[PDB]
């Protein structure tokens, strides 16, 4: 990928990875994680219905005009991978979609994480296992620290945590799982999931002795 970053509201200009020799026909595709790719622009400038007119391509007008995708008033929701599928009269059949330009949109408001911590279910404990589940959502930017405590002692055993990734609302989500024996679960006064984000901390606690 070719990373590019632009501030909210600014005009992004993404250059095609390959330049045309002769007459060209260029398609642009947007690909957001968890979604099918979407056709943004075809035949150089044509815009499918449903695509915002904030998106435009370069016309082929016999200037040495580099094919470029322009996005005016860049929004958080424009953060995606962009593909320029370049066809020209000298290059032969274009099997490659080319590399992605990964557009990161910066300048968004800090948002503190929502944190939900679930203790082990009675059903899991009956099966002789125990998992604490910490779900972290709606935060921005994406850098976060997730720590677990047993009572007040830090813990590093049984801990599996995801890399944060963008949600549909363009904030981040992550989760952390702490695997315990039922005996460990019941023998402590409490366990906490502690999430530190931009210098501040959201912390949830569960206890075997409380509902």
């Amino acid at each position: 990928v070719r990373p590019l970053s632009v501030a909210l509201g600014e005009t992004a200009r993404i250059s095609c990875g390959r330049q045309a020799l002769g007459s060209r026909a260029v398609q642009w595709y947007q690909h957001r994680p968890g979604q099918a790719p979407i056709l943004l622009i075809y035949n150089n400038q044509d815009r499918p219905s449903g695509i915002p007119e904030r998106f435009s391509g370069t016309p082929d007008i016999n200037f040495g005009t580099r094919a470029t995708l322009t996005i005016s008033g860049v929004e958080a929701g424009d953060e995606a991978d962009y593909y320029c599928h370049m066809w020209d009269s000298r290059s032969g059949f274009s099997w490659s979609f080319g590399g992605a330009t990964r557009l990161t949109v910066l300048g968004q408001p800090k948002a503190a994480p929502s944190v939900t911590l679930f203790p082990p279910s009675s059903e899991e404990l009956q099966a002789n296992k125990a998992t604490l589940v910490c779900l972290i959502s709606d935060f921005y930017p994406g850098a976060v620290t997730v720590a677990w405590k047993a009572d007040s002692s830090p813990v590093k055993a049984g801990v599996e945590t995801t890399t944060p990734s963008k949600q549909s609302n363009n904030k981040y989500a992550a989760s952390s799982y702490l695997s315990l024996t039922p005996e460990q679960w019941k023998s402590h006064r409490s366990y906490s999931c502690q999430v530190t984000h931009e210098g501040s901390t959201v912390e949830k606690t569960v206890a075997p002795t409380e509902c």
């Binding site: 990928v1 002769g22 007459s23 060209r24 026909a25 398609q27 595709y29 690909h31 099918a36 790719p37 979407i38 056709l39 075809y42 035949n43 499918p48 991978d81 593909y83 066809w87 020209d88 009269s89 274009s94 099997w95 490659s96 979609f97 080319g98 590399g99 992605a100 939900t116 679930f118 279910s121 009675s122 059903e123 899991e124 099966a127 998992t131 589940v133 779900l135 959502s137 599996e160 945590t161 995801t162 990734s165 949600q167 989500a173 992550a174 989760s175 952390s176 799982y177 509902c211």
Partner: protein, 230 residues
């Protein structure tokens, strides 16, 4: 209102044949050219091939003649078969319509034109993993609501391969739903959680069921989530 939905095996062993289907709705397959594109972990989009009207298919040489694309008009289905698979064939596979354009840059009579394709309608994709490891269906546990809105959910534990889909109340409950990205454990097994924030005063009266689907293992678990016995 033409719509595309892919379906596949979820897991194939190396050296076997990967077979995916795309069901077409809202129009006749006959009114479109068809294509498959895949999206591999760590790689960009890869164009597999396309098939025109007269059942004539053209394939990306990158797949080294391992690919067959075909139509079954009696089912309005598009098919892809990829043989001799390796872990490099692990990807999300998408079906799409293709629009053929013709750019003339000189006299047509002298063949001074080229055809190009725009992919205008895409399916949602279907994940296929190529591994010698055996599939494993998840164990599903309820994540009961606080006793003190409240969040409740389902823990979808220890499965392979990706993905798992979760709905709530058989699709009827969508607002406030959040299914989180799975964690990949050291064991190479996945776990995820799905949460829904619902009104606290709905608890005990309103039924909340998380529907878990892991296609590769043919696991469908319907898990009621009720308030803590305490």
């Amino acid at each position: 209102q033409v719509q595309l939905q892919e379906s596949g095996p979820g897991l194939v062993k190396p050296s076997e044949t990967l077979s995916v289907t795309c069901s077409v709705s809202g129009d006749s397959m006959n009114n479109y050219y068809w294509t498959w594109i895949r999206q591999s972990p760590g790689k960009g989009l890869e164009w597999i091939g396309y098939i025109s009207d007269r059942e004539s298919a053209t394939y990306n040489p990158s797949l080294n003649s391992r690919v067959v694309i075909s139509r079954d008009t009696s089912k309005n289905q598009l098919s892809l078969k990829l043989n001799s698979v390796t872990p490099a064939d692990t990807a999300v596979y998408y079906c799409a319509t293709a629009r053929r354009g013709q750019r003339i840059y000189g006299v047509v009579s002298f063949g001074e034109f080229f055809y190009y394709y725009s992919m205008d309608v895409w399916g949602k994709g279907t994940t296929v993993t190529v591994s010698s490891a055996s599939t494993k269906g998840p164990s599903v546990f309820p994540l009961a609501p606080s006793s003190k809105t409240a969040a409740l959910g389902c823990l979808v534990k220890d499965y392979f391969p990706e993905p798992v889909t979760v709905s709530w109340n058989s699709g009827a409950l969508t607002s406030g739903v959040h299914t989180f990205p799975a964690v990949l454990q050291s064991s190479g097994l996945y776990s995820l959680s799905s949460v829904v924030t619902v009104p606290s005063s709905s608890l005990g009266t309103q039924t909340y069921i998380c529907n878990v689907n892991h296609k590769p293992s043919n696991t469908k678990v319907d898990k009621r989530v009720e308030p803590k016995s305490c």
